[PDB]
């Protein structure tokens, strides 16, 4: 049995989980946390269930996307679970800021961001090998399922060119883990496809200057 005393949570984020992420410097510049957040058991069945659009091109993908809009400040985010404003208010602070800069030596200070909840859910939803657009600076992708079959296929690929099977590592799509990169003309990277109907649930935080 645990004790009878309180213990220490000072955020949604454990920022030491970003400061102190696997880096990688080749093939490109990216970091990799696990345990990036303090309470991960709620934020699975807390994400949002409705106000996604299917989107897809056949670069080819297809999974649905639900943003964050600027009625979900206005509202004070009243049609999501108060988490997701906890989190939005994090990734806002100077702690996050502040953990980017210490972890690949980059300052988002002044910058804006996008943030939107992506889901793939039904066989075949992926992505194909692709860098990101010059005009993201960074890009943020956090991963929320509590459990993972990885025969199901939609891991996170990293790779060394733009092909599928050009694979360097991989990232398990599993509550805690995250992924984070500058995008450069060699940050190739894709989803494998779902084999099987299963929510594959995430947010990304796209860093930018210049709006697109
Ligand atoms: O969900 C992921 O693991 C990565 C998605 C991605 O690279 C994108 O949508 O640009
Ligand atoms: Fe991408």
Same mark, same amino acid.
């Not at 599928?164 to 989803?191: C, K, T």
């Given at each position: 049995?645990?004790?009878?005393?309180?213990?220490?949570?000072?955020?949604?984020?454990?920022?030491?989980?970003?400061?102190?992420?696997?880096? =990688?410097?080749?093939?490109?510049?990216?970091?990799?946390?696990?345990?990036?957040?303090?309470? *991960?058991?709620?934020?699975?069945?807390?994400?949002?269930?409705?106000?996604?659009?299917?989107?897809?091109?056949?670069?080819?993908?297809?999974?649905?996307?639900?943003? %964050?809009?600027?009625?979900?400040?206005?509202?004070?985010?009243?049609?999501?679970?108060?988490? $997701?404003?906890?989190?939005?208010?994090?990734?806002?602070?100077?702690?996050?800021?502040?953990?980017?800069?210490?972890? %690949?030596?980059?300052?988002?200070?002044? @910058?804006?961001?996008?943030?939107?909840?992506?889901?793939?859910?039904?066989? +075949?939803? $992926?992505?194909?090998?692709?860098?990101?657009?010059?005009?993201?600076?960074?890009?943020?992708?956090?991963?929320?399922?509590?459990?993972?079959?990885?025969?199901?296929?939609?891991?996170?690929? +990293?790779?060394?060119?733009?092909?599928?099977?050009?694979?360097?590592?991989?990232?398990? *799509? =599993?509550?805690?883990?995250?992924?984070?990169?500058?995008?450069?003309?060699?940050? $190739?990277?894709?989803?494998? *496809? @779902?084999?099987?109907?299963?929510?594959? @649930?995430?947010?990304?935080?796209?860093?930018?200057?210049?709006?697109?």
């Amino acid at each position: 049995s645990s004790g009878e005393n309180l213990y220490f949570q000072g955020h949604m984020i454990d920022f030491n989980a970003i400061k102190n992420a696997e880096l =990688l410097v080749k093939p490109f510049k990216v970091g990799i946390t696990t345990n990036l957040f303090t309470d *991960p058991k709620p934020l699975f069945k807390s994400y949002p269930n409705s106000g996604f659009h299917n989107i897809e091109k056949g670069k080819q993908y297809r999974f649905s996307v639900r943003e %964050i809009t600027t009625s979900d400040l206005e509202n004070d985010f009243k049609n999501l679970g108060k988490c $997701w404003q906890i989190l939005y208010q994090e990734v806002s602070s100077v702690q996050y800021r502040d953990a980017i800069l210490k972890a %690949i030596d980059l300052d988002i200070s002044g @910058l804006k961001f996008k943030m939107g909840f992506y889901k793939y859910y039904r066989t +075949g939803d $992926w992505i194909s090998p692709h860098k990101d657009k010059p005009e993201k600076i960074l890009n943020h992708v956090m991963f929320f399922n509590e459990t993972w079959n990885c025969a199901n296929g939609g891991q996170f690929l +990293g790779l060394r060119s733009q092909n599928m099977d050009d694979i360097v590592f991989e990232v398990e *799509p =599993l509550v805690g883990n995250s992924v984070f990169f500058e995008p450069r003309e060699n940050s $190739w990277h894709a989803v494998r *496809p @779902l084999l099987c109907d299963q929510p594959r @649930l995430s947010v990304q935080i796209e860093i930018f200057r210049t709006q697109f």
